[PDB]
């Protein structure tokens, strides 16, 4: 139940809830596909480069070549249910249901590992600098530095399920289960 | 680092907020309200809207904010607060509604039908799935409509209502 991307050569590619990931051209013939262990619940993100990364419910993170070819895999300790965010240096970002955000070196290596309380169900953020914003399900938004370390948390009442958003003046703004919208500064 | 301010709805915020060219900050609530709320932090104006606002609503560039509704409904939002027409779904909308190049607004219904809205709100089309659509629907760079898993065969679908081909 995921929505589908286009690629910059004009490629569809989407998840299904049956476990395949298929790679479909615009006539609709299948050009490839590639099954993962379980149903794929995020949409895939399509790399500077070209490289099709996807989240899966097996707790890989799956880096795909145009072609067809695997890249790379990367293990996490439980399933994936947001899409990965590219930096600018092209580091992936990517959040897991056990609670761990990841830096994902784009050669297939982790660069560094951020630990929330509880399980992260949407896509991180990048700010105008560079920081990277995330909401955690234990209540706290998460602003961690390039470097791997933690800048500040944000202490909400419940869970936040959704991703920020930045505002020309870089006030993050987020939506919390508790009722209540927030505005944090930089 | 710190907080701004904070502003308190009734029930939980499912989705990301939607910021407009003027700052303004629009989100949805579960409490059935899309809430209207300034840099300031205080309430320009919220629309009553019968159960839910699941998705994040989104805005055209006629500065007209559509959002779906767990009620079934999708509306059209004047910036001035009041409703600029509603548009009616079986079920309820779980997606986000998304406007292409001409303006038609197209949202997927948990009554399993793909609907493309006229800019003035009458319906263009309908488009029947097996199931319901929970994904949002895409625009490719001819104008191709794509829509979600309805039953695990993605559709695409075509600008006149018509159909290009299953999976």
Known sequence: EASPVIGEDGTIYVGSNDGHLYAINPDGTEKWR??????????????????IYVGSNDGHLYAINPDGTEKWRFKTGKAIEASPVIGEDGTIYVGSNDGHLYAINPDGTEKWRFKTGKAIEASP????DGTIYVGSNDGHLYAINPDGTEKWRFKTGKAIEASPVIGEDGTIYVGSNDGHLYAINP
């Open 34 to 51: 590639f099954k993962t262990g379980k149903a794929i619940e995020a949409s895939p993100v399509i790399g500077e480069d070209g490289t």
């Open 125 to 128: 953020v990048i700010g105008e």
